[PDB]
PDB file of C-alpha atoms and ligand atoms in Angstrom:
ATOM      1  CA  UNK A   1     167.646 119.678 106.665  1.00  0.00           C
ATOM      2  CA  UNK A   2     165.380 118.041 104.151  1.00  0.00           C
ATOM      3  CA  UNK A   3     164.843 116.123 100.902  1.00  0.00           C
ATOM      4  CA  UNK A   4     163.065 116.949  97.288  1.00  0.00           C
ATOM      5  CA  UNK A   5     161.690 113.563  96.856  1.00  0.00           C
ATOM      6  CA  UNK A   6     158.959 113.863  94.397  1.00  0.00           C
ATOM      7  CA  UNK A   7     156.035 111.151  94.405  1.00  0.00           C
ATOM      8  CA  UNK A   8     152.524 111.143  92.710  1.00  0.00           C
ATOM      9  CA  UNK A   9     149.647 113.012  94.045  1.00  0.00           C
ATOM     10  CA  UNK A  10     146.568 110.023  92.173  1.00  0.00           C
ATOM     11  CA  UNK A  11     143.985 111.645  92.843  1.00  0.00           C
ATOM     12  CA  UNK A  12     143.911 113.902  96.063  1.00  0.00           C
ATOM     13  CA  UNK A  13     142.689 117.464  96.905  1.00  0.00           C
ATOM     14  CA  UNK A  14     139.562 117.913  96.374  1.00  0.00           C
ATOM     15  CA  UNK A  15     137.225 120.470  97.840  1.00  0.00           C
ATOM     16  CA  UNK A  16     133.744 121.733  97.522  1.00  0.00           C
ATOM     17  CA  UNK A  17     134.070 124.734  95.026  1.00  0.00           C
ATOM     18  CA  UNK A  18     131.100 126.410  96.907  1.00  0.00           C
ATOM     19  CA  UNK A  19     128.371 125.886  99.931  1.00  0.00           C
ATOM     20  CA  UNK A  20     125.459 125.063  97.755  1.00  0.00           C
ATOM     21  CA  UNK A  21     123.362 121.667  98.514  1.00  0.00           C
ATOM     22  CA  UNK A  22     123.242 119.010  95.704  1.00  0.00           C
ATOM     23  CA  UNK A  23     122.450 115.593  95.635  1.00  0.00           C
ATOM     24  CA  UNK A  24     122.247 112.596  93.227  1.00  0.00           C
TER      25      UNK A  24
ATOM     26  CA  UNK B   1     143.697 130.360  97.649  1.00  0.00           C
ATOM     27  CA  UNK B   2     143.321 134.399  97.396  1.00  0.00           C
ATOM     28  CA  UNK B   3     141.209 134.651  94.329  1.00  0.00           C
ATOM     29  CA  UNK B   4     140.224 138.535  94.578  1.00  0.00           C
ATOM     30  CA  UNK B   5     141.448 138.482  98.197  1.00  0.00           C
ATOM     31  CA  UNK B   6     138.938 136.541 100.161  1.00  0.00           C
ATOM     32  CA  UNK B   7     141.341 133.784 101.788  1.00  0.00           C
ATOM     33  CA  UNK B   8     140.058 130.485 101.262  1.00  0.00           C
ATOM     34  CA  UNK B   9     141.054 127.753 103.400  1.00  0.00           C
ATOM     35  CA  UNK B  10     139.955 123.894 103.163  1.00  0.00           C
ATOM     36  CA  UNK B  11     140.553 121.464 105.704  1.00  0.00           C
ATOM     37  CA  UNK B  12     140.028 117.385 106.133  1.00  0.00           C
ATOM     38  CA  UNK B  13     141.677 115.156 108.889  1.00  0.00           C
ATOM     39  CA  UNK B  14     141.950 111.105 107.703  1.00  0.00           C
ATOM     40  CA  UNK B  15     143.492 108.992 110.425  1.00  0.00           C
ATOM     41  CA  UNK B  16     145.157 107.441 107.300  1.00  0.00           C
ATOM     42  CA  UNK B  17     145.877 103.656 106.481  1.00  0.00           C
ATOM     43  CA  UNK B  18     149.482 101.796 106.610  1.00  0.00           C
ATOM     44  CA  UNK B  19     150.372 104.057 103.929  1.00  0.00           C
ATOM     45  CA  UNK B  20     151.287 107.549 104.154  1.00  0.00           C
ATOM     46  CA  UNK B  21     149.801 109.357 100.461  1.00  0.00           C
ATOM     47  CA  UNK B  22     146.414 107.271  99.921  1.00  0.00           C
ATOM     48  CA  UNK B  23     143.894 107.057  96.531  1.00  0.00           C
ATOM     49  CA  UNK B  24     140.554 106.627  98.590  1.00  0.00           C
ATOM     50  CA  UNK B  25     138.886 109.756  97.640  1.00  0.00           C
ATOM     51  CA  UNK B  26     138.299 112.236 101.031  1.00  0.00           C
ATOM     52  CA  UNK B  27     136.841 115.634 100.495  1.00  0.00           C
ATOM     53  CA  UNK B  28     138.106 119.045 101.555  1.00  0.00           C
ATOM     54  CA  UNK B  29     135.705 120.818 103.862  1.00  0.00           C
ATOM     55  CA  UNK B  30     135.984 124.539 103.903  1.00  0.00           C
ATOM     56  CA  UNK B  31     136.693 126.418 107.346  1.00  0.00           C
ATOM     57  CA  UNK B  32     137.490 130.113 107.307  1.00  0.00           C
ATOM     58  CA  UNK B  33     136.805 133.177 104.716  1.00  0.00           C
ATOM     59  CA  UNK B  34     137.996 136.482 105.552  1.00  0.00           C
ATOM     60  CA  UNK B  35     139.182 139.299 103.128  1.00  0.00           C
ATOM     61  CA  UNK B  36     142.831 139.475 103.307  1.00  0.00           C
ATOM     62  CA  UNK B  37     143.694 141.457 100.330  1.00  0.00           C
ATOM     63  CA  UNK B  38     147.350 141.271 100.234  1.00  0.00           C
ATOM     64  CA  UNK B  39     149.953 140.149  98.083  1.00  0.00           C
ATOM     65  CA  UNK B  40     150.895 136.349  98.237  1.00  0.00           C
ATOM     66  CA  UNK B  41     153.472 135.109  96.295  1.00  0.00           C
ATOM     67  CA  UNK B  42     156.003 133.430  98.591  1.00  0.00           C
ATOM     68  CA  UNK B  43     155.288 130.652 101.188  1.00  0.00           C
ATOM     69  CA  UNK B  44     156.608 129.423 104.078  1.00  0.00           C
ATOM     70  CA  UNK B  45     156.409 126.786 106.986  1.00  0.00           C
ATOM     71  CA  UNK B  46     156.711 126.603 110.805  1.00  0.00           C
ATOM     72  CA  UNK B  47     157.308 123.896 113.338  1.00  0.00           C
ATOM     73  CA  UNK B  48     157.896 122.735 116.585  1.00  0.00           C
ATOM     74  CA  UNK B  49     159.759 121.488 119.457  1.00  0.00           C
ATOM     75  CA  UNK B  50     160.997 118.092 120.306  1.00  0.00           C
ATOM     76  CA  UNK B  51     163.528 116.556 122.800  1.00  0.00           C
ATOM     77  CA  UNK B  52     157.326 112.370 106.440  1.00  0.00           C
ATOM     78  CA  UNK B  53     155.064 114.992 105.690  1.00  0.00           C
ATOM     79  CA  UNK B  54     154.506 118.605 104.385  1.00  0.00           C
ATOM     80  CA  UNK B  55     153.429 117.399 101.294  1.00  0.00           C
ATOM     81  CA  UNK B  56     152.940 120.554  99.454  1.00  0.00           C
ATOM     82  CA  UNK B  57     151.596 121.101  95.984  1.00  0.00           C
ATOM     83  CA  UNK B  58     149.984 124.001  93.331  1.00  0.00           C
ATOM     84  CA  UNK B  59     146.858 124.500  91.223  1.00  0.00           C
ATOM     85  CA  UNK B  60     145.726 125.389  87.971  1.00  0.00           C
ATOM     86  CA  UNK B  61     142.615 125.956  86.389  1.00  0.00           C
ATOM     87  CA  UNK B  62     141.057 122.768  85.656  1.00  0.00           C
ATOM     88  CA  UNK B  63     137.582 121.294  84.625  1.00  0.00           C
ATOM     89  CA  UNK B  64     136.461 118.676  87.085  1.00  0.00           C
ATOM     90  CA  UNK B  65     133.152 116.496  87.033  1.00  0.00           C
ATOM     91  CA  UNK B  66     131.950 115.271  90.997  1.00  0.00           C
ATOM     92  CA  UNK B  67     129.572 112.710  91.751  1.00  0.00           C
ATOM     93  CA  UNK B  68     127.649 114.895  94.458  1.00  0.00           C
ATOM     94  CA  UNK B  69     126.373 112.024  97.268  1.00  0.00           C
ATOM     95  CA  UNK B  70     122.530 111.784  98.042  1.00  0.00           C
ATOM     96  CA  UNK B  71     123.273 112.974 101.578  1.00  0.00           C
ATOM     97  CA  UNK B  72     125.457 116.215  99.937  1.00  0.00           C
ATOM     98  CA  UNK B  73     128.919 114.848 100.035  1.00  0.00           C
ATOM     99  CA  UNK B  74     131.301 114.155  97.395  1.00  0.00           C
ATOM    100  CA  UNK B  75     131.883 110.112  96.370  1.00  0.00           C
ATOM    101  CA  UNK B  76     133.850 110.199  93.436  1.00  0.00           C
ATOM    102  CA  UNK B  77     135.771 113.239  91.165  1.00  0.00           C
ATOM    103  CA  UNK B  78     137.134 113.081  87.519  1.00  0.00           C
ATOM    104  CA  UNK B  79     139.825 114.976  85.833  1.00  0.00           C
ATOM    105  CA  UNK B  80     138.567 116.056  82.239  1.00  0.00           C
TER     106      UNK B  80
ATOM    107  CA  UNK C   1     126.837 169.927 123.780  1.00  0.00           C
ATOM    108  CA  UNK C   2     128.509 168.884 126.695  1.00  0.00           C
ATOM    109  CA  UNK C   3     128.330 171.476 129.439  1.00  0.00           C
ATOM    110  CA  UNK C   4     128.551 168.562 132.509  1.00  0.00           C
ATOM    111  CA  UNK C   5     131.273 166.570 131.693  1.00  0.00           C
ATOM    112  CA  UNK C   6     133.622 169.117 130.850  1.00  0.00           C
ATOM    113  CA  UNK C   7     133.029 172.258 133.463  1.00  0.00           C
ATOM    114  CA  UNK C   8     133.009 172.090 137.010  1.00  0.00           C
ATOM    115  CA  UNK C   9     133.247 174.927 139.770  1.00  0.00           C
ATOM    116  CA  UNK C  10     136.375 177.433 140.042  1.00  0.00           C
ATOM    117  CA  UNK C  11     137.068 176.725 136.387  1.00  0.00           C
ATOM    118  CA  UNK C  12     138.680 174.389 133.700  1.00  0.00           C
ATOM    119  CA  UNK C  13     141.513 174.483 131.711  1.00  0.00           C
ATOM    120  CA  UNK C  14     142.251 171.129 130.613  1.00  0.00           C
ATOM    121  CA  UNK C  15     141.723 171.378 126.688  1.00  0.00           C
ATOM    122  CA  UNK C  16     144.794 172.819 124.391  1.00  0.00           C
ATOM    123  CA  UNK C  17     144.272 174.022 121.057  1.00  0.00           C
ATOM    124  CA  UNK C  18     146.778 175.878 118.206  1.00  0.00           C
ATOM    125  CA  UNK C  19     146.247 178.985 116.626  1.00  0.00           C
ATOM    126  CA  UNK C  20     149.929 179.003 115.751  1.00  0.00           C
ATOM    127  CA  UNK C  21     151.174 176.780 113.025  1.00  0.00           C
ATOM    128  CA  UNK C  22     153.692 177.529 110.524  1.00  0.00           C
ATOM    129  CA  UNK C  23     151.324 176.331 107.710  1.00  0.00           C
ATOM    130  CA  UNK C  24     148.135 175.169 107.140  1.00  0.00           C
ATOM    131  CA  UNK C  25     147.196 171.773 108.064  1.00  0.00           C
ATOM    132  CA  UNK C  26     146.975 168.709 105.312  1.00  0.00           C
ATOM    133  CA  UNK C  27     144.027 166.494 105.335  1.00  0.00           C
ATOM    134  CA  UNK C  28     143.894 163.661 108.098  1.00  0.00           C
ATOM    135  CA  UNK C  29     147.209 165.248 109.783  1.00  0.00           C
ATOM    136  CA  UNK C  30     147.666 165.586 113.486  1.00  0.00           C
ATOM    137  CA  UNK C  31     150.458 167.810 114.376  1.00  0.00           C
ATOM    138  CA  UNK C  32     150.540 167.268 118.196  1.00  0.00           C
ATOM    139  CA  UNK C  33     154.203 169.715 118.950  1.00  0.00           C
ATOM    140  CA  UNK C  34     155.571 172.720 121.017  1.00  0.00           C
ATOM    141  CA  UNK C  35     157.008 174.621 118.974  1.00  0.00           C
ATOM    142  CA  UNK C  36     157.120 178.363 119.415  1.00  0.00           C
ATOM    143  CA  UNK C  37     156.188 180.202 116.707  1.00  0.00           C
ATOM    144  CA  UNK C  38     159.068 182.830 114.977  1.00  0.00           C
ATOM    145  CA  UNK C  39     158.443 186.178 114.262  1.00  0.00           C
ATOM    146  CA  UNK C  40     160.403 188.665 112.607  1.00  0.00           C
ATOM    147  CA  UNK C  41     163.906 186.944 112.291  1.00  0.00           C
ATOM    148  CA  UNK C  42     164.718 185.661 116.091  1.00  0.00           C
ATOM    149  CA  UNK C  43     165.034 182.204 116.510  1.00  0.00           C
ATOM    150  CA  UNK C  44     163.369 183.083 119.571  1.00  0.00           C
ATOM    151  CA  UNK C  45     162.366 179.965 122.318  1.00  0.00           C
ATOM    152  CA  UNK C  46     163.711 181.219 125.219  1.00  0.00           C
ATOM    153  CA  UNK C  47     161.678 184.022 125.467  1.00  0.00           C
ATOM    154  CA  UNK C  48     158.026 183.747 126.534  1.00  0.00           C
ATOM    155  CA  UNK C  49     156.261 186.855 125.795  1.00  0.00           C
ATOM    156  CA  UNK C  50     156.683 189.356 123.255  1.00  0.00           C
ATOM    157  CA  UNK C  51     157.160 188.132 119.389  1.00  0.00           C
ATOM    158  CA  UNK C  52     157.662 184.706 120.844  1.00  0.00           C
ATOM    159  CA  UNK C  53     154.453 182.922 121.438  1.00  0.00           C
ATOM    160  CA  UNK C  54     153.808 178.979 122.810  1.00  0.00           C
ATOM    161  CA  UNK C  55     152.022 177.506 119.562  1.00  0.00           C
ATOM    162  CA  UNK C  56     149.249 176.411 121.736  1.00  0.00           C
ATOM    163  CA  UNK C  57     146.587 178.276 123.779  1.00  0.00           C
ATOM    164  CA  UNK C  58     143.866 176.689 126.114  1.00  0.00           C
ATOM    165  CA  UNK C  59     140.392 175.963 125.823  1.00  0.00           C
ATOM    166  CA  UNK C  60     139.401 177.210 129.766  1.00  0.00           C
ATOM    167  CA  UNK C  61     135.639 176.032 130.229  1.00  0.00           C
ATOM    168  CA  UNK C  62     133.695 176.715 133.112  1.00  0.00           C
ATOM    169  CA  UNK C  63     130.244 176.179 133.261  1.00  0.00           C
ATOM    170  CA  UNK C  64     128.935 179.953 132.756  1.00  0.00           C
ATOM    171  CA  UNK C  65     129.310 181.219 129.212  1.00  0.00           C
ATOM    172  CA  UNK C  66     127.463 182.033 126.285  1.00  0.00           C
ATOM    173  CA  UNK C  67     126.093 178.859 123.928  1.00  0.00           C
ATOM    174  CA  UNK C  68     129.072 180.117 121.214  1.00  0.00           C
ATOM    175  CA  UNK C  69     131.517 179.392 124.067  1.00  0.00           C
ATOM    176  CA  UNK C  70     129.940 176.367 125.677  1.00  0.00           C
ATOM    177  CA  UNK C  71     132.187 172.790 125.513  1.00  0.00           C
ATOM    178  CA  UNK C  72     130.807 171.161 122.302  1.00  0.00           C
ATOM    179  CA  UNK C  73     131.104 167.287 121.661  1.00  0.00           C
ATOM    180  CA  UNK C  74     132.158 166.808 118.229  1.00  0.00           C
ATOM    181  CA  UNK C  75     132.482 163.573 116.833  1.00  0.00           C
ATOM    182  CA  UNK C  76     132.883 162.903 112.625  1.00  0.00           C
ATOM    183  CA  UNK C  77     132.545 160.049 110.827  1.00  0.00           C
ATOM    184  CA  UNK C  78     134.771 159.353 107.899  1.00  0.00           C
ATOM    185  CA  UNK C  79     133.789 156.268 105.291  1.00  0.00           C
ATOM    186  CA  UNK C  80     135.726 154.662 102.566  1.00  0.00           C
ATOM    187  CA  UNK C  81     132.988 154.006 100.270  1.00  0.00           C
ATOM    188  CA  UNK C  82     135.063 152.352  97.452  1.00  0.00           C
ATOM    189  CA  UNK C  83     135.792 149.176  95.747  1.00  0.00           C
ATOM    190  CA  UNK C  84     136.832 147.105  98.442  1.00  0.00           C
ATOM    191  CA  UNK C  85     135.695 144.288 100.367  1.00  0.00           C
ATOM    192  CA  UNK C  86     133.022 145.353 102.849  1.00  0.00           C
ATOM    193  CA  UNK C  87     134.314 145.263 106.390  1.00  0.00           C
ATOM    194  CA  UNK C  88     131.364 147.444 108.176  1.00  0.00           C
ATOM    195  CA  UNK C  89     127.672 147.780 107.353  1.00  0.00           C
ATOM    196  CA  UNK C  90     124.170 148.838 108.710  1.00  0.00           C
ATOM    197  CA  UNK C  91     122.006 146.765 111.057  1.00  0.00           C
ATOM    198  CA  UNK C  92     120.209 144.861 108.459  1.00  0.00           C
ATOM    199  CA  UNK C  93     116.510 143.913 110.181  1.00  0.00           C
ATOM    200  CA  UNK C  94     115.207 140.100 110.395  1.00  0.00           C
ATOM    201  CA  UNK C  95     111.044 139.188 110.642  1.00  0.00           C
ATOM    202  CA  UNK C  96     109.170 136.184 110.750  1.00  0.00           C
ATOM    203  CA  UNK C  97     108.741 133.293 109.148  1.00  0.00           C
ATOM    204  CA  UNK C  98     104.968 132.109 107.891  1.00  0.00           C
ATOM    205  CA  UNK C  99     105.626 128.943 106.230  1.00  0.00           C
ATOM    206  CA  UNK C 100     102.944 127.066 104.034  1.00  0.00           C
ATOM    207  CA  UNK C 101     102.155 130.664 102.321  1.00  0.00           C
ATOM    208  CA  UNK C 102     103.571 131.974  99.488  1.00  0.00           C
ATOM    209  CA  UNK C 103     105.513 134.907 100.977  1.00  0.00           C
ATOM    210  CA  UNK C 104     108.191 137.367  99.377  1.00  0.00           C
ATOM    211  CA  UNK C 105     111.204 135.922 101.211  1.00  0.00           C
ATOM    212  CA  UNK C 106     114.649 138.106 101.608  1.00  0.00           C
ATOM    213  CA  UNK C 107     116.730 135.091 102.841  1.00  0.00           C
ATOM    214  CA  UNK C 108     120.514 136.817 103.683  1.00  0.00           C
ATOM    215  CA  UNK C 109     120.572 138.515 100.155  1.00  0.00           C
ATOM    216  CA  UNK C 110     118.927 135.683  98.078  1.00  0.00           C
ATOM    217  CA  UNK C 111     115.734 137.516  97.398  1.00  0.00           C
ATOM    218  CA  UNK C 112     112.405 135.596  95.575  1.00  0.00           C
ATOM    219  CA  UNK C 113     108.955 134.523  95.895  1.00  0.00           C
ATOM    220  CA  UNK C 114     107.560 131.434  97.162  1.00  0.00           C
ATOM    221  CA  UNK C 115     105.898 129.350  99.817  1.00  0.00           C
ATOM    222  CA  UNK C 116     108.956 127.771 102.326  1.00  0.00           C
ATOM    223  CA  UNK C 117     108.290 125.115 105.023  1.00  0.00           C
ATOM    224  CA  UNK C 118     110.188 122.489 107.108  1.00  0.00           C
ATOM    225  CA  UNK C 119     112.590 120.128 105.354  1.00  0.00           C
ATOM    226  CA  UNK C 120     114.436 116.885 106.040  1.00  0.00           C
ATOM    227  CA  UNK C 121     117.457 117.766 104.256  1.00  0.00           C
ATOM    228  CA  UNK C 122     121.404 116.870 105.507  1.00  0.00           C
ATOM    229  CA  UNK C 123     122.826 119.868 105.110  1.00  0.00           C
ATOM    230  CA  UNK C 124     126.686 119.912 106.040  1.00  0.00           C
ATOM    231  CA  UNK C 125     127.244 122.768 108.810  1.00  0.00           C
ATOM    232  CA  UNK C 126     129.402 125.145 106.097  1.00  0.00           C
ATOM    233  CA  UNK C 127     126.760 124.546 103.781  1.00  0.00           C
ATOM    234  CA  UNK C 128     124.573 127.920 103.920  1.00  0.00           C
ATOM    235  CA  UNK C 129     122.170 127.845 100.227  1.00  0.00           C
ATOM    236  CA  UNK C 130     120.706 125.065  97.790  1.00  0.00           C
ATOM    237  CA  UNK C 131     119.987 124.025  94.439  1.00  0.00           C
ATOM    238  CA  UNK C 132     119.057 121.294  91.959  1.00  0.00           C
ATOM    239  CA  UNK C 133     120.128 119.642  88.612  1.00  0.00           C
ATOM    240  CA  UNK C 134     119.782 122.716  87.068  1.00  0.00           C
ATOM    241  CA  UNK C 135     121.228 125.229  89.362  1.00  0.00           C
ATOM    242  CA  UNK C 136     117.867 126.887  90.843  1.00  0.00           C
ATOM    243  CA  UNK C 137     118.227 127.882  94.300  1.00  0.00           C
ATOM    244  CA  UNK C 138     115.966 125.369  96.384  1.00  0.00           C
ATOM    245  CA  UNK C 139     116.970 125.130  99.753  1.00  0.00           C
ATOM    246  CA  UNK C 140     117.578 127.753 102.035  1.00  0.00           C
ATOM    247  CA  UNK C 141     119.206 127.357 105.491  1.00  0.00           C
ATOM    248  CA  UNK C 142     117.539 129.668 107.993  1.00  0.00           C
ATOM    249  CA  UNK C 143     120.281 132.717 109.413  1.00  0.00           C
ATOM    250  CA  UNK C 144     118.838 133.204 112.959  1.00  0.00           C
ATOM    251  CA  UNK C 145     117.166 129.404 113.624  1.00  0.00           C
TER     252      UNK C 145
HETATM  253  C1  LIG D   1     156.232 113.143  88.228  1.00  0.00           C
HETATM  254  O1  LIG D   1     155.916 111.923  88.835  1.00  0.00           O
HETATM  255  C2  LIG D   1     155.690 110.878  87.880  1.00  0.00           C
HETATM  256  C3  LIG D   1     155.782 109.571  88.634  1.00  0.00           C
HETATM  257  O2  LIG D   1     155.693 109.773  90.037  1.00  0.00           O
HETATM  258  C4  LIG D   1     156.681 110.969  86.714  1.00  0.00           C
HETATM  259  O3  LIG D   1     156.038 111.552  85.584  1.00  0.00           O
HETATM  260  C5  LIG D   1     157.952 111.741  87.064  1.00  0.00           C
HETATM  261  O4  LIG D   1     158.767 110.965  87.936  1.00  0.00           O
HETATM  262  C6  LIG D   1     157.654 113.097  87.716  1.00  0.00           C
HETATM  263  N1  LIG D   1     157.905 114.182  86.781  1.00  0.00           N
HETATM  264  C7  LIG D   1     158.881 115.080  86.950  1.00  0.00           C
HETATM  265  C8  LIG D   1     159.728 114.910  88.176  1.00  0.00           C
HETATM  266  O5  LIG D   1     159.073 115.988  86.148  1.00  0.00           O
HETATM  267  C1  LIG D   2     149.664 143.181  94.595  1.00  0.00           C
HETATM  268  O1  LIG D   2     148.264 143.074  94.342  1.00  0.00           O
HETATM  269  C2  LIG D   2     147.717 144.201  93.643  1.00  0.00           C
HETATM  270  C3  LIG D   2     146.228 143.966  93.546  1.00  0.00           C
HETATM  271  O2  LIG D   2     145.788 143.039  94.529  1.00  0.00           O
HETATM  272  C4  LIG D   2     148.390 144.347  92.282  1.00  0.00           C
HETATM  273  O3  LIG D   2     147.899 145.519  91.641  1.00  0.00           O
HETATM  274  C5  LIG D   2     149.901 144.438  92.445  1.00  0.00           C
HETATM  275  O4  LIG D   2     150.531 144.428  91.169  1.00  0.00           O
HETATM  276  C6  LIG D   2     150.420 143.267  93.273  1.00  0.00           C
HETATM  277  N1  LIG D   2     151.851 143.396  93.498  1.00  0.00           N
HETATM  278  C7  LIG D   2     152.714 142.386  93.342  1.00  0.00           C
HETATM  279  C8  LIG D   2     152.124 141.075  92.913  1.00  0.00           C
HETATM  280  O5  LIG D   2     153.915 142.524  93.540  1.00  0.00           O
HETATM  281  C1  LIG D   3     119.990 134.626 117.819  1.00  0.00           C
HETATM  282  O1  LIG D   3     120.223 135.680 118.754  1.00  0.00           O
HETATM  283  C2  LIG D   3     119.254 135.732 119.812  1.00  0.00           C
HETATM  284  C3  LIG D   3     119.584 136.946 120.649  1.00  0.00           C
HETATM  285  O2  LIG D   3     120.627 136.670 121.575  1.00  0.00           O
HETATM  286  C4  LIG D   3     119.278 134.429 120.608  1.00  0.00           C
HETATM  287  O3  LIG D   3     118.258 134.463 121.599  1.00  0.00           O
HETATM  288  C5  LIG D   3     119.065 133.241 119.680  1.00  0.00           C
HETATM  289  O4  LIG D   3     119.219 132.024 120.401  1.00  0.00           O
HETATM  290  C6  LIG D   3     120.066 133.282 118.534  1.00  0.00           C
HETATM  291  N1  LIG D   3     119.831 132.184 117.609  1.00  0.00           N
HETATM  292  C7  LIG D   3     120.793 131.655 116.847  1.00  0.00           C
HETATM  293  C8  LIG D   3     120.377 130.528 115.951  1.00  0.00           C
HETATM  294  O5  LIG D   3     121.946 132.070 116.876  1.00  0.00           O
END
């Protein structure tokens, strides 16, 4: 079995959109 | 994802704190791309044996501002 | 042609081919079955010889015959040159380096001009290009070193 608790995601799931180098 | 085939998958691994969902920001580090090219529009899970978690949820097209790191990670990310 | 690998003394008749089918043959179809043919209006397969023929005869090679009847090796090549993801392409060919000069560079695709040399970047291992403020390709992470 299982449950359809919901809860808040804040902020989470984030990933780099691409492979290019960048800094400051 | 499977924008124009191409299966994207992203990947992170946080030992975590007392709490299960956190807010401290962690980036998603990509693994694997190979062209699938199929349909995907259902999704399912397996699991294991034994003698909380799955925390699943969906994107949409967004516009997001990152603070890129000096050494090339990411630091902090804003909804706009 | 391959006259060694398949002929040998006192003959060979390993190969099968059809010169009986009871139509022509689509594209891409293999239509590996013994059937024997009909003629006239016998539904002949019982009978061997006369107006019932096996659909397949062989392709006996021995290593004595004219160059028209000498055991060819055929082999065809079939692409799918469409719109698809690329799966299979041509040996593309690396060369040098020569930093500290400007040199046409072909970097994996990324093609420009410029003079490259060493760096002390921190590039992440996925990370493959690089760029600036104003998304101009900067850095470029060597294929083959
Ligand atoms: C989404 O979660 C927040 C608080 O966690 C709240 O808006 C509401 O409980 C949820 N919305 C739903 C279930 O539609
Ligand atoms: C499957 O994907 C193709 C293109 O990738 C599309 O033309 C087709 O409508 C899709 N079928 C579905 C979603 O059932
Ligand atoms: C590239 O391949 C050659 C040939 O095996 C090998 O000697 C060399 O170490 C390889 N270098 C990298 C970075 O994979």
């Amino acid at each position: 079995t299982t449950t359809q608790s919901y809860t808040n995601s804040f902020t989470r799931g984030v990933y780099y959109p691409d492979k290019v180098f960048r800094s400051s | 994802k499977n924008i124009d085939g191409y299966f994207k998958i992203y990947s992170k691994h946080t030992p975590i704190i007392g709490r299960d969902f956190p807010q401290g920001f962690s980036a998603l580090e990509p693994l694997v791309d190979l062209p699938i090219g199929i349909n995907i529009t259902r999704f399912q899970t397996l699991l294991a044996l034994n003698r909380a978690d799955y925390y699943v949820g969906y994107l949409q097209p967004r516009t997001f501002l990152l603070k890129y790191n000096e050494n090339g990670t990411i630091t902090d990310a804003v909804d706009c | 042609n391959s006259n060694k690998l398949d002929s040998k003394h006192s003959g060979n008749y390993d190969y099968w081919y059809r010169l009986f089918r009871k139509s022509k043959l689509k594209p891409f179809e293999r239509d590996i079955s013994t059937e024997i043919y009909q003629a006239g209006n016998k539904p002949c397969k019982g009978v061997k010889g006369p107006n019932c023929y096996f659909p397949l005869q062989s392709y006996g090679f021995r290593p004595t015959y004219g160059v028209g009847h000498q055991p060819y090796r055929v082999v065809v090549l079939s692409f799918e040159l469409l719109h698809a993801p690329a799966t299979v392409c041509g040996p593309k060919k690396s060369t040098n380096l020569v930093k500290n000069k400007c040199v046409n560079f072909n970097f994996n695709g990324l093609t420009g001009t410029g003079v490259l040399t060493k760096s002390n970047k921190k590039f992440l291992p996925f990370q493959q290009f690089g760029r600036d403020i104003v998304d101009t390709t900067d850095a470029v992470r060597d294929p083959q070193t």
